[PDB]
């Protein structure tokens, strides 16, 4: 059923992830019980400086609460069937443009769609299951913004091999460099 789980975008990479999905529910009766209404939009790849790549799963927005009880086992099973990759779940959220002086009839644009809000939504959706406890923006002397983002100490072991991957995919998906730090 690899032709059933996509959203009208046929490529080779999405069909191999789709068939990988198809044999991963077959060994488990309850992942069958939750996985069937759970769709995804599209997939793309991105490379990191560590010699490997990263697989980004885009997620339609009301399906995110459905994914938020299955994401850990799905990520670990997809990483131990796909070596030389990094599995990151992110939610496709449409940005609306800022209206100019001549911007015609566009409705009152919701701040859930606005640019800085969707940018840090991509930031906390990047690093699940730990949560962000403080941001801090590092203004370089030469006029360069670097973001420093903090974490909790509860579940550091699932993310600590993926920090540079998160930095690479974040700097490709918003153009802004970032650094991560655990508190002592």
């Amino acid at each position: 059923p690899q032709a059933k789980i996509l959203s009208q975008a046929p490529t080779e990479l999405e069909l191999q992830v789709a068939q990988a999905f198809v044999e991963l529910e077959n060994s488990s009766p309850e992942l069958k019980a939750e996985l069937r209404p759970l769709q995804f939009k599209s997939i793309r790849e991105i490379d990191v400086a560590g010699g490997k790549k990263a697989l980004a799963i885009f997620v339609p927005v009301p399906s995110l609460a459905g994914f938020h009880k299955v994401q850990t086992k799905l990520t670990r099973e997809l990483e131990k069937k796909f070596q030389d990759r990094h599995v990151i779940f992110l939610a496709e959220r449409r940005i609306l443009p800022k209206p100019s002086r001549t911007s015609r009839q566009v409705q009152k644009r919701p701040r859930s769609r606005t640019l800085t809000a969707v940018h840090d939504k991509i930031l906390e959706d990047l690093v699940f299951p730990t949560e962000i406890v403080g941001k801090r923006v590092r203004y370089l002397v030469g006029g360069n913004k670097i973001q420093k983002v903090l974490l909790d100490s509860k579940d550091v072991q699932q993310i600590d091999y993926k920090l540079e991957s998160f930095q690479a995919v974040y700097n490709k998906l918003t153009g802004k460099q970032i650094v991560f730090e655990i508190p002592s």
Binding site: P29, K32, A33, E34, R36, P37, G66
Partner: peptide
């Protein structure tokens, strides 16, 4: 609000699919 009713119908369909497959999950 027809779109709210459509979203409620989609949520009811997802819950109906989950409740239909819960019997197959509890059978194994």
């Amino acid at each position: 609000n027809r779109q709210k009713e459509r979203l409620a119908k989609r949520d009811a369909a997802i819950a109906k699919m989950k409740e239909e497959a819960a019997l197959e999950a509890s059978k194994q």
